[PDB]
Write a protein that binds this ligand. Sequence first.
Ligand SMILES: *[P@@](=O)(CCCCCC)OCC
Length: 197
Amino acid sequence: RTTRDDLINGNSASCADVIFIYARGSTETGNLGTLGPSIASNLESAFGKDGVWIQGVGGAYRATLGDNALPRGTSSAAIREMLGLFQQANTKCPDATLIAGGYSQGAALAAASIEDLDSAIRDKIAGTVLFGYTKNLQNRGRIPNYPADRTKVFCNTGDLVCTGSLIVAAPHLAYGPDARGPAPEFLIEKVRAVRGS
Ligand SMILES: *[P@@](=O)(CCCCCC)OCC
């Protein structure tokens, strides 16, 4: 449900073909929060339960609201945690195609992590989805050092965090439909683009 640790719990002798690493929003529960489970269910439908590993960013990532104000939009500890998961994926399952996502603070975390990542690992992330991207204006809708064609940003009209503010208005909490349809649709398309079908 809201907690998935498929990568950490997974057997390297039986690696999934696709590994999804997701960071939740501020104050959300488990390691997937409100949007992660919806995306996970659709990925499982497309690749099969054993074909995809769902991994939320837990550990040191406390999803503390105040951390949105820090330089990178999240804490250094959180960035270290997500980088560690990408590194664990690369080591445990070198042939797996990676995909990533994040919501709100988790989107800033995903962007910061991907920016700092070793290029050889970053290049294995076939697609990344960001909801209510807090650094949308600052980064011009991009993730530094990562291609635009592999990036999809969902920023609602009226969601102030997408326009350079840290105010939480109603549109910031309305990404449900995107997580149920277009976000997994994009991730599936990007994985099939490189893996075939
Ligand atoms: P997001 O981190 C919230 C918006 C960040 C700006 C507020 C200071 O997660 C929503 C639960």
